[PDB]
Structure formats: C-alpha cells, structure tokens
Write a protein that binds this ligand. Structure first.
Ligand SMILES: O=C(O)[C@H]1O[C@@H](O[C@H]2[C@H](O)[C@H](O)[C@H](O[C@H]3[C@H](O)[C@H](O)[C@H](O)O[C@@H]3C(=O)O)O[C@@H]2C(=O)O)[C@@H](O)[C@@H](O)[C@@H]1O
Ligand SMILES: [Ca+2]
Ligand SMILES: [Ca+2]
Ligand SMILES: [Ca+2]
Ligand SMILES: [Ca+2]
Ligand SMILES: [Ca+2]
Ligand SMILES: [Ca+2]
Length: 480
C-alpha cells in the first residue's frame, strides 16, 4: 500500500516545514497495516518536537520510507532549530517497533544553521530494559551534517541491516551500533566524521561488518568496545573485507570484546596503529593488508595488549587471550602479546615482538629481525612426567637475525642445562632443536622451548638475551 507524501501536503521546496505532512503519510501507512511512504526528488524541511526523544519523524511498524535516491530526496532539519533532537527519523521509545526501514534518501542535520546534539537515524526500545526493535532496514541512505551521530541504531535492535549507505561530515560518529543484536553492516562508507567511522558498543553481539570503508574520520575508522559503563562486553563481532584508512587514530580498535575477528581488510595511512587490540578474549586477525600506519608517530602497525580497568568502572583487569594472527601482510612492526591458553602468533615482514604468555603457543616471526619473548619460566615447560603439552614452539627461528628474549628468567647462558644454564639440544631425527633447563623446579616442571629445524650448530649465545644488558645490546625491535 503506497502513500505519497505529496498527497498529504508535503512541499519538498527547501523552505516549507513538511514534518506534519510526512508524519501524516507515515501514520496512514501504519493504520492500513503497513505500506511504503514514497518521496519524490526534493528537499523536505523538518523540525523537532517538544522533547529530544520525539526526534523529527516517527517511523512505525510495517512502514518503509522510499525516496528517489541519495541526494535526490533530502530530508533536512529546518534552519534555527536549537534543541537536542535524537533521531531525524526514529522509532518510539518504549515501543518494540518492527519491520520498518528507509531507502534511497538523505538525512541532512544542518549543523551549520542549527545548535544542539542531533542524530540522524535512531532505533531501539528502552535503555537498560529487555525488549527490542527488530527487522530494521536502511538501504542506500546518506546521512550528513548532523551534529552528533549519523546512523545511531540503539538499545536494543535485533536484525538491523544497514547496507550500501554513507555517513559523512557528522559531528561525532558516522555509524554507532548501541546494543545491536544479530545485525549486519554491509558495503557502507563512513568518511570525514568528527570522531569515528564505525563504533560498535554497549553489549552488541553477533554483528557482521562486511566490506565497509572508513576514512578521513577524526578518530578510529572502526572501534569495537564495551563503552564507558560496567555492562556486558560485546561479543561475536566479525569484520570482513573493506578498508580502514587515513583516520585520525587507529584504523581498527577492538577492546573489552569477546570472539572478535578481523579478516581480509586493507588498513593504511592511519595516524596511530593500523590495528589495536586491548583486552580481547578471542581474537582472529587473518589475511589483512596493513601498511603505512602510525603516521602521527608510534612504532607499531599492530598492537596486541591488555586492558587494565582496575581503576575504572568495572574494577577488572582484562587480558588479551585466545589470539590467532596469521597470513597478514604488515609493512612494519607487530606487537603480538597474549596470555593463558593457546595462541598462534605469526609476524610479518617487520621486526616483530612475539610473546604468547602462559599456555602452549606457536610463534613465527616471518621476515625481518624478530624477538620471541619468554617472560615467565611457567609460560613454556615440560612437566614431571615428560608431557610436552605446555611447551611453546618457534616455527622459523633464524640465527643471526632473530632473538630469544629470556632476559627476565634468570638463566646465565648456554651450558649443560644445570646450575642456571640452558642446554641446546637436537632431537633424535634432527627435526627439532630444544632449549632445556634440566633442573626441575619444586613442582617438577622444566623450562623448555622447541625450535623447528636443526639449529644446534647455527644458533649461538648472541641469539639469546639472558639478562637486561644483553637485551639492550641485542633487541631487534622498538617495542621493549
Ligand atoms: O542510554 C542513554 O542514556 C541513551 O538515552 C537516550 O535517550 C532516551 C532517554 O534515556 C530516556 O529513556 C527517554 O525516555 C523518555 C521517553 O522518551 C518519553 O519522553 C517519556 O515520557 O519520558 C521518558 C523519560 O523522561 O525517561 O528517551 C530518550 C530517547 O531519546 O529515546 C539517548 O539520549 C541516547 O543517546 C543515550 O545513549
Ligand atoms: Ca521503538
Ligand atoms: Ca551549529
Ligand atoms: Ca598463550
Ligand atoms: Ca617479522
Ligand atoms: Ca624473522
Ligand atoms: Ca607460552
């Protein structure tokens, strides 16, 4: 059931306030049980209501607004509006609005000629209560010149899809997904916004971010994060393809998140690290193309690190855990640090720092001069019964180029494996070389590292840093 805004008195002349006419069309479509509100090419001026939560236009269940195309149909806020306006198009607070959407139109926040925080598209039910909008679609929508958030789908929305859309020149974030669930952001561009290209926050989970592009933003290209409150972390965030480039901060930042994945993206020209991972439990960083970042200074293309929130709202320390970093092309240093559990950490052409922490890790440096750090004797060991399920292995150690950093472990040098020395040994068939502490500790464990290949004759004392002085002399990276 199609309704034309023109038939309800909308002028689309750039001067008349068409808010009531477009709302009438929306209400007629809703009362018929659903329909498409069509808008022909033209600039429609709209105004807010008594309160910020009134937005400007109130979309309703089973109503879809179809324009004549981005740039053709433009919905613009009136000159002189001076009130906070939370959603130029929005669904109602306190209602579980469903099966609605917007296509082929532009929202213009008119921040130049207005004052107050304005958001373009706002969805959701009630902050901090159970309940959700659901089945929400934005297709080929452009949102520009709002003073705060362009696309601002909010808590909670299930099965939001935003595809083939653009957010640009907004005051804060182009796209913000607040407690989005089972939702899809595909083939979008967010550029030249005041802060973030994309910001996934507030417990969002099962999100696919496929083939999105973020550039020229004042802050991150994409950030996935808990947010400032003590609430459940986001989880199951899959970022595939796209490009995150020339932003004012990190290209992609992921923090206080569980089961995040970043695969096949191009990440370049950012002012800070290309990829930064802070306190993430389950991180896959696969097959990306990462180069020419840290333009504003900084030593690393990729940073894996913890997130210490002990002085913050949660009181918790969050380790990065369960990391898989493989197949990336990285023209610069990767800092690949993780902790308890099995990590697979592959460096790239740069001079990388690798430390899988506790648990059995498999490390490779790739090209360049890499440092494999072992920070605790309990991070790589054989137990009293000879079980090797906690012995780390280094895949491609290159004597004369790479370095094993044992500077915190209190061994003196190579030797017979007793009295604080480590023994350099080959296995029976000559396929693996070991560094062994032959002295069991009180729990019966032996520090041990396995190295692929036969290195008993090529590996020497200058390939291992046994104390801080040796580390200063021999360290291969800018990261210690
Ligand atoms: O998490 C936030 O704080 C979130 O709040 C959003 O504004 C909400 C606001 O929090 C509140 O729920 C308000 O509720 C109004 C309701 O809309 C209606 O006017 C009712 O008569 O009174 C309620 C009230 O006074 O509590 O609705 C706001 C809304 O805009 O839906 C946004 O500001 C968001 O940016 C922020 O993160
Ligand atoms: Ca709603
Ligand atoms: Ca202004
Ligand atoms: Ca580990
Ligand atoms: Ca390397
Ligand atoms: Ca190397
Ligand atoms: Ca380990």
């Amino acid at each position: 059931m199609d309704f034309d805004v023109k038939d309800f008195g909308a002028k689309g002349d750039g001067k008349s306030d068409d808010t009531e006419a477009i709302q009438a069309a929306i209400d007629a479509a809703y009362e018929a049980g659903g329909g498409t509100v069509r808008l022909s090419a033209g600039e429609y001026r709209v105004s807010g209501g008594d309160e910020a939560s009134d937005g400007a236009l109130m979309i309703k269940s089973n109503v879809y607004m179809d324009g004549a195309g981005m740039g053709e149909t433009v919905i613009k806020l009136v000159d002189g509006w001076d009130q906070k306006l939370t959603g130029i198009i929005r669904s109602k607070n306190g209602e579980k609005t469903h099966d609605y959407g917007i296509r082929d139109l532009t929202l213009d926040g008119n921040q130049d000629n207005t004052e107050g925080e304005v958001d373009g598209f706002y969805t959701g039910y009630i902050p901090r209560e159970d309940g959700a909008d659901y089945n929400v679609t934005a297709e080929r929508v452009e949102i520009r010149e709002v003073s705060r958030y362009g696309f601002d789908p909010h808590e909670q929305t299930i099965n939001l899809t935003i595809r083939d859309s653009v957010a640009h020149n907004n005051g804060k974030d182009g796209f913000v997904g607040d407690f989005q669930i089972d939702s899809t952001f595909e083939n979008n561009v967010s550029h030249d916004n005041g802060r973030h290209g994309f910001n996934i926050v507030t417990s969002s989970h099962d999100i696919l971010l496929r083939d999105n592009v973020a550039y020229g933003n004042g802050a991150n290209g994409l950030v996935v994060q808990r947010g400032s409150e003590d609430i459940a972390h986001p989880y199951n965030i899959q970022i595939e393809g796209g490009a995150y480039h020339d932003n004012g901060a990190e290209g992609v930042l992921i923090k206080m998140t569980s089961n995040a994945s970043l695969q096949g993206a191009e990440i370049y020209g950012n002012d800070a690290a290309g990829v930064r991972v802070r306190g993430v439990d389950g991180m896959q960083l696969l097959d990306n193309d990462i180069h020419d970042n840290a333009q504003g200074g900084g030593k690393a293309e990729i940073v894996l690190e913890d997130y210490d929130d002990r002085d913050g709202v949660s009181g918790n320390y969050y380790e990065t855990l369960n990391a898989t970093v493989q197949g990336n092309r990285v023209a610069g240093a990767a800092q690949l640090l993780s902790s308890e559990g099995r990590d697979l950490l592959d460096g790239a052409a740069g001079n990388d720092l690798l430390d899988g922490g506790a648990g059995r890790d498999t490390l490779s440096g790739g090209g360049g001069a890499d440092t494999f750090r072992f920070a605790d004797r309990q991070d790589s060991f054989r137990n009293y019964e000879g079980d090797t399920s906690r012995v780390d292995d280094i895949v491609d150690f290159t004597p004369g180029a790479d370095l094993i950093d044992l500077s915190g472990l209190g061994y003196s040098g190579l030797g017979d494996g007793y009295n604080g020395t480590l023994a350099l040994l080959l296995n029976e068939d000559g396929t693996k070389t070991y560094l062994k502490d032959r002295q069991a500790d009180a729990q019966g464990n032996h520090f041990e590292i396995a190295l692929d290949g036969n290195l008993v004759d090529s590996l020497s004392a200058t390939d291992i840093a046994f104390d801080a002085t040796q580390l200063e002399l021999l360290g291969t990276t800018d990261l210690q």
